Every structure is written in structure tokens, then in C-alpha cells.
């Protein structure tokens, strides 16, 4: 087509979605991790994660207001990834890299899994 | 902080939100324009438009599944702006610029209003 494009549009949209999350506006699901609860927007979770995409396209699960993650999932690893989903920023540190990679593999967040693999390979 | 950032994350999220819109997945509102109906996600509309932000933060309207726009709003102008919201691409043409600018002013989409003003000023 002959469209023009606003370079900062996608980033501005994501920033506003994160402001709605902060203020708990129109959040439609609670993700439960080892008795730690995280409120979010189903559409953002689906846009970022192959696991949430499969969950919320399921005819029965699409209607659930609570999703319980596998007990092996670490709440801090989930929190870091949820922050990444809404900001593009990943708080990757020596002390959390193993939990973050394991959570990203479970959530099916391929780009996060890739950088964790590379950061681990550099330290060996 | 000491975060790393994935450059293409915001664009990838928006692209996936547009794929959900195409497939009518988790759309939670119908916008009615001069008897033309457009399905969308309330959170994306709020992230892009000052008007939808005000509408869906209102305690009564946040719960509506149908929103009727002012009868002076042109459906094509709305369609072009809805596409912009989900893609960052604006199909601005000599034949639609007046309808697009009037719709962007009503929807409170300041960056769109700005480029329409500049494109109109260049043609005078």
C-alpha cells in the first residue's frame, strides 16, 4: 500500500497497556504461581506467550478468570517475564537466569529462551 | 535498572493483537459507526485514543459491549484509524484526509491529527 507509519506507535501502545496493568484497569485474569497472584490482560499474555495463546484460544479455558501455573514455576521468574511482556525490558541477573529461562521455556517465549541460552553459554 | 531490551517486542505484540482482531479472538466490544460495525479489544482502543480511554474508565460504560459513535463520524475514516491503532500504518490519501483528521480529532489521537494538519498545510 501507500501507508505512512508512526515509528513510536507500538511502543506507546505497550506503555499504555502497562499503565492500565499498574492501575488494575480492565485486567481480566489472575495468574496464580505458588500462591502468588498476578493480574493481567489475557490479550497481552496471548500476544507474548505460546502457552497463554493455547490456553485462551481453548473454548473452555478462554472463559476462566483464574489460571494456575505448574507448581515448579517460580513466582519471581514469572514476575520478571510478566514485566518483560508489558515493557520489552528483561531484568536478567546471575541470581535469576535459571528460574527466568525455565519459566520462559514453560511459557513458550522463544526470544527470552534464546538470550538466556546465550548469556549462560558466555559464563561457562 | 540493569535490564536488557528486545527491540522488536512492542511491534511483535501489536502484530499479534492485530492477528487476534482478524480472527475475532477475545474482542470484547463492537463500535457502531453510521450502521457499520467494528469489533475490537477495549484495551487496544484505550491505548490509542483519548476518547476510548475516557469511555472505558467510566464505571458504567466500561461494562458496555456496544458503543455508538457520533452520527457525523464517517465509517471509512474510522476503519482507517482502527487499522492504524493495530498496525502503526495510516492509509492517508487526498480523498480521505478530511474524514481521517475529523475522526482523529473526535477520537483524540493527537499524533494522527498532527500529520493530517501537516499534509493539509503542504497542499495549500
Amino acid at each position: 500500500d501507500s501507508c505512512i507509519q508512526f515509528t513510536r506507535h507500538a511502543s506507546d501502545v505497550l506503555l499504555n497497556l502497562n499503565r492500565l496493568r499498574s492501575r488494575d484497569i480492565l485486567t481480566d485474569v489472575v495468574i496464580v504461581v505458588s500462591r502468588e497472584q498476578f493480574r493481567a490482560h489475557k490479550t497481552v499474555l496471548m500476544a507474548c506467550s505460546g502457552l497463554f495463546y493455547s490456553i485462551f484460544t481453548d473454548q473452555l479455558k478462554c472463559n476462566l478468570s483464574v489460571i494456575n501455573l505448574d507448581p515448579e514455576i517460580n513466582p519471581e521468574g514469572f514476575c520478571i517475564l510478566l514485566d518483560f511482556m508489558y515493557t520489552s525490558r528483561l531484568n536478567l541477573r546471575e541470581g535469576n537466569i535459571m528460574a527466568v529461562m525455565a519459566t520462559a521455556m514453560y511459557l513458550q517465549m522463544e526470544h527470552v529462551v534464546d538470550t538466556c541460552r546465550k548469556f549462560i553459554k558466555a559464563s561457562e | 535498572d540493569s535490564c536488557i531490551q528486545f527491540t522488536r517486542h512492542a511491534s511483535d505484540v501489536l502484530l499479534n493483537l492485530n492477528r487476534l482482531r482478524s480472527r475475532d479472538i477475545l474482542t470484547d466490544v463492537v463500535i457502531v459507526v453510521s450502521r457499520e460495525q467494528f469489533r475490537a479489544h477495549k484495551t487496544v482502543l484505550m491505548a490509542c485514543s483519548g476518547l476510548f480511554y475516557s469511555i472505558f474508565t467510566d464505571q458504567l460504560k466500561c461494562n458496555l459491549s456496544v458503543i455508538n459513535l457520533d452520527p457525523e463520524i464517517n465509517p471509512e475514516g474510522f476503519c482507517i484509524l482502527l487499522d492504524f491503532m493495530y498496525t502503526s500504518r495510516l492509509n492517508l490519501r487526498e480523498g480521505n484526509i478530511m474524514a481521517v483528521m475529523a475522526t482523529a480529532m473526535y477520537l483524540q489521537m493527537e499524533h494522527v491529527v498532527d500529520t493530517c494538519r501537516k499534509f493539509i498545510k503542504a497542499s495549500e
Binding site: 501507508c3 505512512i4 507509519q5 508512526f6 515509528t7 | 500504518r89 495510516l90 500529520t115
Partner: peptide, 4 residues
Amino acid sequence: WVIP
């Protein structure tokens, strides 16, 4: 704004 840019030409994509």
C-alpha cells in the same frame, strides 16, 4: 512518521 516514515515511509515504511
